[PDB]
């Protein structure tokens, strides 16, 4: 069995290495707002479809929804578990999903007849810590857990629709697609797997990183994505080609990546690092031209659906919007 | 108009400020006992498929929140979330004791727990007293047990050969990775059932925050 698996892996490597056929400038993204009000370290954020509202989670156990233009705090939600490693914002804007170390994903209904943001669903069934959750629709949500298994849930039923198994290490992040048919997800086994939502099975596996993947994003095209890991290197993996493209890394960076995101055009790959600073790259050439200077480890990153601005969070309790 | 949205934001920041006063007072602790260690025993005495099993108590008028770990076998990633805790709390049964030394040393000299002190609890030394007296010899597991000699005074009421092993494991833990300055071990002897566990945490945390204050004011 092992000899056959090794032969299959060698054949796969040869097939994905068979062909191998083949300047933005200083961005100087200036901060415009500074959403202060979080009492503990920031873990994850998510923008809105309207490109105006955003949501952030803190180690205090607070999920705060900000109006980015006018800096106002639209909502403040107290979480049941203080340890939250991810948060989401529904595409329709009616729901927010927070997941963390409590192994349970909480879906809160923003738009309700009452004036309080109450939890619509408590999706339980995962074993390891939740590290990334993203909405497909108001009905179904895909969640990444630390028990080496991703999941797809139907919210009203409250039960797992499909379970995505195959990872060896704890899965840290997942990224959807514009069409929402396939989603990529990276884990601690130094691999990122493309999974098919409908069939509930792994479609592809991408390797090449030295250490565990701590953040994943997905190119707006639908046929590419990018990963960020703890070995201070980012890589762009083609989805339909199953290969490794140019690697965004520098010899002056010794700290890993905590978050990754893209610009709407896809010409800018933004990367929130650990050295108190978020860097930028030209995703088609991997050149660091611009730095988004916080006072602590940048833990989260987001770009509006219209590309208006980019918000960066960090463990200094602050969330800064840059244009 | 829009001004009412600003008033709503101000009234939400008002609640955020009133919750900041509660986030500062409470002292966060992380419990990282072993699999066989009696950390369940020490969290059982709290009268004083989930994830974190939080437990809130208060020694005197100071509130501590101990975060225990439930169904999380690798900790290389969910540990960094506890960078802001006041202290780590190990529980060890003092052969599975070597694994306790290994993961204890690995928790030390990390990248995210560089500014966090550690409180050792040597639980279930009630069995250690009989182990030292009888058959089971720590010499096979640790060659330096025979060479090691006891002179800090132990608790009276026990044989000199039963309180001589305690200091061996205590020394082994305190020089495991503490001796590489910002944080140091605080070894203890938790035995099986003692009601002084909370005080050993209260005084320990008081010492920790006092040292932190001295370092900020440059008293040291």
């Amino acid at each position: 069995l092992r000899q056959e698996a090794e032969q299959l892996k060698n054949q796969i490597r040869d097939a994905r290495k068979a062909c191998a056929d083949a300047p933005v400038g200083r961005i100087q993204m200036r901060t415009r707002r500074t959403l202060r009000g979080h009492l503990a370290k920031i873990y994850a954020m998510h923008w809105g479809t309207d490109s105006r509202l955003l949501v952030s989670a803190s180690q205090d156990g607070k999920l705060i929804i900000w109006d980015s233009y006018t800096t106002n705090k639209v909502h403040a939600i107290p979480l049941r578990s203080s340890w939250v490693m991810t948060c989401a914002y529904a595409p329709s804007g009616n729901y927010v999903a927070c997941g963390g170390l409590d192994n349970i994903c909480s879906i809160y209904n923003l738009k309700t007849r009452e004036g309080n943001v109450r939890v619509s669903r408590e999706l339980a069934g995962h074993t390891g810590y939740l590290s990334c959750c993203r909405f497909l629709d108001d009905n179904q949500i895909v969640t990444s857990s630390g028990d080496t298994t991703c999941a797809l849930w139907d919210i009203e039923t409250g039960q797992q629709t499909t379970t995505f198994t195959g990872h060896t290490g704890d899965v840290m992040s997942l990224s959807l697609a514009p069409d929402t048919r396939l989603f990529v997800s990276g884990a601690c086994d130094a691999s990122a797997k493309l999974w098919d939502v409908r069939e509930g099975m792994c479609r592809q596996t991408f390797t090449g990183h030295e250490s565990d993947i701590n953040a994943i994003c997905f190119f707006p095209n639908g046929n590419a994505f990018a990963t960020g890991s703890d070995d201070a290197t980012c890589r762009l993996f083609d989805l339909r080609a199953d290969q490794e493209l140019m690697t965004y890394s520098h010899d002056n960076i010794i700290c890993g990546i905590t978050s990754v995101s893209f610009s709407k055009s896809g010409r800018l790959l933004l990367a929130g690092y650990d050295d108190f600073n978020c860097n930028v790259w030209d995703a088609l050439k991997a050149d660091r031209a611009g730095v988004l200077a916080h006072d602590n480890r940048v833990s989260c990153l987001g770009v509006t659906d219209d590309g208006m601005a980019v918000a960066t969070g960090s463990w200094d309790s602050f969330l800064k919007i840059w244009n | 108009e829009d001004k009412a949205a600003v008033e709503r934001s101000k009234m939400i920041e008002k609640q955020l400020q009133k919750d900041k006063q509660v986030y500062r007072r409470t002292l966060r602790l992380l419990l990282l006992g072993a699999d066989n260690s009696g950390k369940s025993t020490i969290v059982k005495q709290m009268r004083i498929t989930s994830g974190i099993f939080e437990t809130k108590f208060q020694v005197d008028k100071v509130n501590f929140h101990m975060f225990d770990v439930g169904a999380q076998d690798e900790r290389r990633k969910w540990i960094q979330c506890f960078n802001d805790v006041t202290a780590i709390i190990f529980v060890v049964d003092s052969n599975r004791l070597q694994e306790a030394l290994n993961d204890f040393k690995s928790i030390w000299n990390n990248r995210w727990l560089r500014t966090i002190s550690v409180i050792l609890f040597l639980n279930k030394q009630d069995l250690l007293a009989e182990k030292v007296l009888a058959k089971s010899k720590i010499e096979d597991y640790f060659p330096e047990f025979a060479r090691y000699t006891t002179d800090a005074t132990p608790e009276p009421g026990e044989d000199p050969r039963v309180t001589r092993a305690k200091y061996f494991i205590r020394k082994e833990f305190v020089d495991i990775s503490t001796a590489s300055g910002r944080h140091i071990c605080y070894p203890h002897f938790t035995c099986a059932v003692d009601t002084e566990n909370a005080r050993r945490i209260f005084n320990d945390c008081k010492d920790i925050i006092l040292q932190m204050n001295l370092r900020e004011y440059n008293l040291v």
Partner: single-chain antibody, 229 residues
Framework: VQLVESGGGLVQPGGSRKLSCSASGFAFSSFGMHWVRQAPEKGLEWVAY????????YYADTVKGRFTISRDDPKNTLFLQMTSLRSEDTAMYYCVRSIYYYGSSPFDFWGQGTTLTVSADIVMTQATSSVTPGESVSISCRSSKSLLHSNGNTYLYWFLQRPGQSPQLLIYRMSNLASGVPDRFSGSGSGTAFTLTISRLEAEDVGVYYC?????????FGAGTKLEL
């Protein structure tokens, strides 16, 4: 989400009465509260407004020194006390819920209401008060000033008070319709001239339609178009 108004009765002119609005079914502590007057033979009119935590209060220019508003969040109740009741303060008073944040729907829910027996602001007018079920109808409204703000909002509200029941909301900020209303109401305008279009027409669309502005703090209503079909 239900608000029960209490008060009313036969009151001699010059007296004092404290009307109440008990709210239950929502987070009253987070929703600004208005009062809206409606004369028996006239349209609606604004009375007073109190913020969520009573940090800001506005009063109508018609009566300002005789009216007082208050709220009790722990009991989730609202109070409006009136003194020296003139011959004009003998109308139908509605306590209105309204929250303000981005994307919100102020004036979303209106209370049941209680009866009573005894300048430079923007003025909103309507072409007439009258307009067969099954075909599209249009209602025209006019404002004395551009209601479109610099941010982009056009503070126009449509209510459609149906006979025999309290008013509701059709469309807030001109363009965005309410939640529970059928998706057959639409609104458009240029800033001063407005039009509300209803595609179908059923036994529920019959009633008087109102036209409210929220740009400036005084909240002046329209006249009301009575659609009989």
């Amino acid at each position: 989400v239900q608000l029960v108004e209490s008060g009313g009765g036969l009151v001699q002119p010059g007296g004092s009465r404290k009307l109440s609005c008990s709210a239950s079914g929502f987070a009253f502590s987070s929703f600004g509260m208005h009062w809206v007057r409606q004369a028996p033979e006239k349209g609606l009119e604004w009375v007073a407004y109190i913020s969520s935590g009573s940090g800001t209060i506005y009063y109508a220019d018609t009566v300002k020194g005789r009216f007082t508003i208050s709220r009790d969040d722990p009991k989730n109740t609202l109070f409006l006390q009136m003194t020296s009741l003139r011959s004009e303060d003998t109308a139908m008073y509605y306590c209105v819920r309204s929250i303000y944040y981005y994307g919100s729907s102020p004036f979303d829910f209106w209370g049941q209401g209680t009866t009573l027996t005894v300048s430079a602001d923007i003025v909103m007018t309507q072409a007439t008060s009258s307009v067969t079920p099954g075909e599209s109808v249009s209602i025209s409204c006019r404002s004395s000033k551009s209601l479109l703000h610099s941010n982009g909002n056009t503070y126009l509200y449509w209510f459609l008070q149906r006979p025999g029941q309290s008013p509701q909301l059709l469309i807030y900020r001109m363009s965005n319709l309410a939640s529970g209303v059928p998706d057959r109401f639409s609104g458009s305008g240029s800033g001063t001239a407005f039009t509300l279009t209803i595609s179908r027409l059923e036994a529920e669309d019959v009633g008087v339609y109102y036209c409210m502005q929220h740009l400036e703090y005084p909240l002046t209503f329209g006249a009301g178009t009575k659609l009989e079909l």
